[PDB]
Amino acid sequence: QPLNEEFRPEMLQGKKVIVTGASKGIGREMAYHLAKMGAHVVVTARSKETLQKVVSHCLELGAASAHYIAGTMEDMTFAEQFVAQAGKLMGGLDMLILNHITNTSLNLFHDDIHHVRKSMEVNFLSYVVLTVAALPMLKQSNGSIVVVSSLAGKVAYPMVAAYSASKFALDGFFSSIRKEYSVSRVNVSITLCVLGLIDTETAMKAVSGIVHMQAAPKEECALEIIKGGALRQEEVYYDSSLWTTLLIRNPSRKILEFLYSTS
Amino acid sequence: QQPLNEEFRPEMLQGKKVIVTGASKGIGREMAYHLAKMGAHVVVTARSKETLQKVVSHCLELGAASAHYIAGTMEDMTFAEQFVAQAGKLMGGLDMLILNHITNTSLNLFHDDIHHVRKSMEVNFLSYVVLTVAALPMLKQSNGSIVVVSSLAGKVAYPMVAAYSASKFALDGFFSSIRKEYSVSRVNVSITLCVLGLIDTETAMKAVSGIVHMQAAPKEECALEIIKGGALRQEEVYYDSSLWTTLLIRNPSRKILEFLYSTSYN
Amino acid sequence: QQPLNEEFRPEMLQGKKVIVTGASKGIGREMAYHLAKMGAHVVVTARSKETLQKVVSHCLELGAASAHYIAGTMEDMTFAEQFVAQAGKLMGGLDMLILNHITNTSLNLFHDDIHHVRKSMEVNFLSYVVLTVAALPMLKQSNGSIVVVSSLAGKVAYPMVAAYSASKFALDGFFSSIRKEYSVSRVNVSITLCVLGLIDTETAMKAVSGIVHMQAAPKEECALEIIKGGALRQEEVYYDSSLWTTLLIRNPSRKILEFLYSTS
Amino acid sequence: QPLNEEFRPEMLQGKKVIVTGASKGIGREMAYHLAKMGAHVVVTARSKETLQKVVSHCLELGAASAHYIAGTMEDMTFAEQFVAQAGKLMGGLDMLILNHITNTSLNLFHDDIHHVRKSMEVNFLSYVVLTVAALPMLKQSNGSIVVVSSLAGKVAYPMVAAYSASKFALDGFFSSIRKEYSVSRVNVSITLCVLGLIDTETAMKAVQAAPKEECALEIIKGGALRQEEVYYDSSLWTTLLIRNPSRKILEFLYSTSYNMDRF
Ligand SMILES: NC(=O)C1=CN([C@@H]2O[C@H](COP(=O)(O)OP(=O)(O)OC[C@H]3O[C@@H](n4cnc5c(N)ncnc54)[C@H](OP(=O)(O)O)[C@@H]3O)[C@@H](O)[C@H]2O)C=CC1
Ligand SMILES: NC(=O)C1=CN([C@@H]2O[C@H](COP(=O)(O)OP(=O)(O)OC[C@H]3O[C@@H](n4cnc5c(N)ncnc54)[C@H](OP(=O)(O)O)[C@@H]3O)[C@@H](O)[C@H]2O)C=CC1
Ligand SMILES: NC(=O)C1=CN([C@@H]2O[C@H](COP(=O)(O)OP(=O)(O)OC[C@H]3O[C@@H](n4cnc5c(N)ncnc54)[C@H](OP(=O)(O)O)[C@@H]3O)[C@@H](O)[C@H]2O)C=CC1
Ligand SMILES: NC(=O)C1=CN([C@@H]2O[C@H](COP(=O)(O)OP(=O)(O)OC[C@H]3O[C@@H](n4cnc5c(N)ncnc54)[C@H](OP(=O)(O)O)[C@@H]3O)[C@@H](O)[C@H]2O)C=CC1
Ligand SMILES: O=S1(=O)N=C(NC2CCCCC2)O[C@H]2CCCC[C@H]21
Ligand SMILES: O=S1(=O)N=C(NC2CCCCC2)O[C@H]2CCCC[C@H]21
Ligand SMILES: O=S1(=O)N=C(NC2CCCCC2)O[C@H]2CCCC[C@H]21
Ligand SMILES: O=S1(=O)N=C(NC2CCCCC2)O[C@H]2CCCC[C@H]21
């Protein structure tokens, strides 16, 4: 059940939020928006020097508190330990923003099992490890899980097959536990964010010469992810095309989920 | 891909070289029997050495051009890679790869079972990728087909099967994206994704015991519809007891979006 | 149009001035009863004065702010125009126009019955247009609502009801086109199209007897669902036993095409 | 049940065809294509002077025969008598092409009920009267009914409300009788043509505009091939979005819940 209210930046004031993949791009823009809202933030990514700079800017913007923990989400021990440390720094957890992805470029799939497994481990499995480690704190606070996904996580997309598989897996996993939490009365919301092309340095470089469309602003995108999570909405759609929002919706899937629940 | 604009006939499988994974029992075993009756060459796999021998003997009795088994676990990526090479040598090539095995799954609330999530991802998804890579040179030689067995839980959220659902959704994203790559790269290997509802296999029936459920569809007809879709090079096959579910779960809006996004790249 | 970004509550109809056509029986009668319970002012119409009298009696008892009837045939475009003016006088204005009447129809294959095709177009479609023209000045003053009752046969082809299907499809074409016109001309009058499946009315139960084997949804909740759609200023609403009927409304491909073409 | 053959102009050789609204625009272009194919043509519209020039040009183009019968489709007695006359002259009827409309300009609906009624009578009711009159001859030849419609006959369009109502009515009526014919074994095909903006003198004055000559040939093709729907527009994105597969699936599923054996 989402909040039938309009978003207010005050909803995040004093909230204890983790943002992963927060050294750059959308993740960094989220940490900044949260800081301006006066949230307590714990940021993570591999790059410690850039995470240092992010935390310092968060404090300038007005974050209630800001800390970083550096490590790779390839390392499942780090993922589990990071949540416990982040929780101890803030005295709890209200929102878990799962955003990091392994480095990926546009290429036809041929024999690249390494990139398929790496995408699955980093983009999907670590999200599950982080969720398990965070849930006790989120159940205590009636908190929220925010999962960053893509158009390639809802429809087939050539040149990003391993990435698409990892994003599709997030939908299957997180949408299925959302139904389980509903019937078991676990009051932790799950927001799946479906994004189109965003003007991050990573995406702009990856798509240069190959895919040409725009390219919605990263600042506005980060805010839409936070708003959807704050409002406990099931899904957020953020793309520059009006065709997307209308056609991406799946009432047929929603009908089937309702019909197969009464069994 | 472009499907074959014709009616299926069992002679389409006569002398064809087919791998069936997860073929010691359930739908996989039924598929092996259908292919044997059609006069195909079959190489079956699963872990169960003894039941695989029995399935192989019955396949020969039904009319298989040839039938052999290779036992092993698809948790082992080395076995998956070696199995394809050996199946290929046994038949002298490969025309159709039917990816059907799954790891053991029950209906349970997800709590902290990362081990089951990882094992489902490894067996149900990654091993199908490894098998495809190993089989691809032979399939490109024969203008062959990959048949991927999936579920309603691979298209919509289903509670109590989160890890299974995640792995079946992953198959869709992977296989559908490479299908788009093959169409533009002119790789004449078809990819068929099969979306099944509840089927009366011993595994599923035991799994749904203790729960109210809809009518389970028959495993023999199910297995035949999977082969038909693959033989006809169709993109997707839907098979469920309900005609309403079968026809309405198919997503033309997604197909429209895929077409729209395709115009924005080179 | 912009729908009400809020949950429906029966107090939304309190003191509202509502016309309900085809309200002597079936869904129209149930809608009058719901509005009566909500404290609305109601004016009911149909051809039968005796049955309309019984409806008004129950409405007054249920707690309607005021309840009246005007008997006449919607085959007569002069009666249609005059009925609205007279209904507006009885209430001192108009907030909601619920178009629900249809001409008598049975299930049959189409052969040479042009009379039934014409009568269906006149009663089920043309009179709705005449009633709308007559109501619009009052609706414009109150920022009112038009509610149009339609069917599965108004969104898909339906054998045995071809003349009926043609009239319901006509309502969609006409009312959906004027809704686009009201958005450009900035007319703050909402238009709601209601897509209904089989409802347990005496008429439909008799008409489907031995032909259709399907679950008939209840008229009481059907009636409230129509009222809610109008009260929330929603463009399209549905009511049927099957959840799959949702696919007949809010069609995304149709919305994109409409957006595309208007901007050109 | 469409003919699974490629179109060939010989399919219309010696066929007995009625074309309504054939003195100008699309109708005139259809009359000309049918003439080049060596069909027997009977054309109609109100204006004898323009119909005379169409007939003369049809004969020059190679028509097996070409004649006109002038009248208004506002008159239902004329509509019924016209079909009897045209069919008695040709010695039968293989195809009925219903193309005429009442004169219409782009305007907001402005209490002009007279225009709504005339559009319904001419654009819709006369098509039903023409069908009833033609049905016995069409049953004898296993013939075809071709109904010319519009994008405004499938989606809402401001400024053509009366026109849209009448085109939507054609869809409901003709698509419902096609389903009745299918079960009653009436071997008369019904083709609904959904046209976008065409470069006719009328449309160009009233308003990317598709050519009228290719439009006319596409209508004939779909009718000859017994297709249920023909879509013709300059934009490939329009042709993609105009289809409604959910509607066709639901029509089939609803058919499983009724028994028509009584009729
Ligand atoms: N940009 C776009 O067009 C779109 C983006 N998205 C989604 O938005 C999210 C962010 O995208 P975007 O900001 O463009 O990407 P960026 O590459 O800009 O940032 C990804 C972040 O993840 C971190 N990261 C990378 N590898 C690891 C690792 N092994 N362990 C831990 N952290 C890691 C990176 O930092 P560091 O290198 O310091 O570790 C970085 O902070 C993703 O989930 C993506 O799928 C969805 C649709 C489109
Ligand atoms: N039955 C149903 O209701 C539905 C089934 N499906 C799909 O159909 C397919 C078959 O289902 P079903 O026949 O019901 O299931 P079964 O459990 O009957 O068969 C699964 C097969 O996989 C084999 N297998 C299990 N573990 C491994 C392993 N680690 N390595 C290799 N092979 C293994 C099993 O044999 P062994 O133990 O000898 O290894 C068996 O032959 C699956 O892809 C499933 O998701 C989809 C929707 C519904
Ligand atoms: N019932 C169902 O299954 C479904 C109903 N619908 C729609 O719901 C609406 C109501 O259906 P339902 O309640 O079943 O119908 P009813 O037959 O119960 O009532 C129709 C109403 O219209 C009146 N009426 C009939 N002819 C005329 C006329 N010439 N002039 C004025 N009023 C007239 C009738 O009264 P009187 O005879 O006294 O004039 C009666 O009050 C209709 O729009 C219908 O299309 C849509 C789908 C399914
Ligand atoms: N052109 C376009 O952009 C589009 C056209 N269409 C459809 O294509 C068809 C033809 O359009 P188009 O060629 O542009 O139209 P035109 O105006 O060019 O021709 C209309 C024809 O109908 C005749 N007609 C008019 N009033 C009557 C009447 N009362 N009785 C009999 N015949 C009459 C006219 O002749 P006369 O006045 O001598 O009687 C003329 O022959 C129509 O069905 C229209 O809805 C659909 C989408 C777009
Ligand atoms: O909107 S998406 O589906 N996701 C993304 N995600 C990016 C893919 C490359 C790594 C950064 C994220 O990119 C778009 C452009 C390339 C193809 C897929 C589309
Ligand atoms: O049709 S399904 O989505 N797939 C399956 N797949 C089975 C899951 C249990 C083990 C064998 C396969 O089961 C159905 C019943 C349990 C819930 C999901 C549905
Ligand atoms: O839902 S509907 O399309 N509308 C109706 N409308 C009724 C048709 C007969 C008179 C009362 C209204 O009936 C349903 C059952 C018969 C076939 C059509 C379907
Ligand atoms: O393609 S249509 O839907 N049909 C038409 N039909 C014409 C409408 C005016 C008279 C000639 C036919 O025109 C297009 C341009 C005006 C608005 C609607 C679109």
| Cβ of C216 less than 6 Å from ligand 7 | no
Contact B177 A165 (CB under 8 A): yes
Which position among A163, A181, A237, A238 bears the catalytic label? A163
The protein residue with its alpha carbon nearest to ligand 4, atom 11, reads D26
Best mutation site among B164, B171, B195 for ligand 6 pocket (most ligand atoms within 8 Å of CB):
B164
Closest residue to C247, CB basis, from A4, A242, A252: A252
Residue C86's Cβ-count burial label (10 Å; 0-12, 13-18, 19+) is middle
Q: Please identify among residues 213-252 of chain C the ones whose CB lies closer than 8 Å to any CB of chain A.
A: 243-244, 246-247, 252
CA B193, CA A156: separation in Å to the nearest integer?
12
Task: Report the helix count and the strand count for chain B, using DSSP H and E.
Answer: 10, 7
Separation of C113 CA from ligand 3 center, angstroms? 20
C22, D71, D124 from D46: Cα distances, Å: 40, 5, 17
CA A248, CA D55: separation in Å to the nearest integer?
52
Torsion sign across C-alpha atoms D88, D121, D123, D115: positive
Check whether C214 is labelled as a binding-site residue: no
Which position among D163, D231, D254, D258 bears the catalytic label? D163
Q: Is C257 on the interface with A (CB under 8 A)?
A: no
Neighbours of A, requiring at least 3 CB pairs below 8 Å, are B, C
Torsion sign across C-alpha atoms C78, C79, C82, C88: negative
Catalytic-residue membership of C239: no
Instruction: Mark out the alpha helices in C92-120 (DSSP H runs).
Output: 114-120
- Find the CATH number of the domain harbouring D145: 3.40.50.720
| Cβ of B219 less than 6 Å from ligand 2 | no
**Determination technique for this PDB entry?**
X-ray
| Packed helices A48-61 and A25-36: angle between N→C axes, nearest 10 degrees | 30
Closest residue to A212, CB basis, from B133, B176, B264: B264
Closest residue to B248, CB basis, from C244, C252, C253: C244
Instruction: Provide the token pair at B196.
Output: 């099944």
The protein residue with its alpha carbon nearest to ligand 2, atom 46, reads B151
Q: Which residues have C-beta within 8 Å of that of residue D36, sequence separation ≥ 6?
A: D9, D61, D62
Q: Which residues have C-beta within 8 Å of that of residue B7, sequence separation ≥ 6?
A: none
Report yes or no: B124 and B102 within 8 Å, Cβ to Cβ. yes
- SS3 state at D177: helix
Rounded (5°) CA angle A229-A234-A237: 80
CA B143, CA A61: separation in Å to the nearest integer?
60
The reported resolution of this PDB entry, expressed in Å, is 2.0
Instruction: Mark out the alpha helices in C10-95 (DSSP H runs).
Output: 26-37, 49-62, 77-91
Report yes or no: B122 and B72 within 8 Å, Cβ to Cβ. no
Q: What atom of ligand 7 comes closest to residue C211's alpha carbon?
A: 16
* Overall number of domains in chain D: 1
The protein residue with its alpha carbon nearest to ligand 1, atom 46, reads A150
Minimal CA separation from C130 to chain D, in Å = 7
- Report DSSP state, residue D9: G
Distance, first Cα to last Cα, chain D:
21
> What residue numbers bound the domain in which B195 lies?
1-266
CA A259, CA A251: separation in Å to the nearest integer?
12
Q: Which residues have C-beta within 8 Å of that of residue D77, sequence separation ≥ 6?
A: none
CA B7, CA B234: separation in Å to the nearest integer?
12
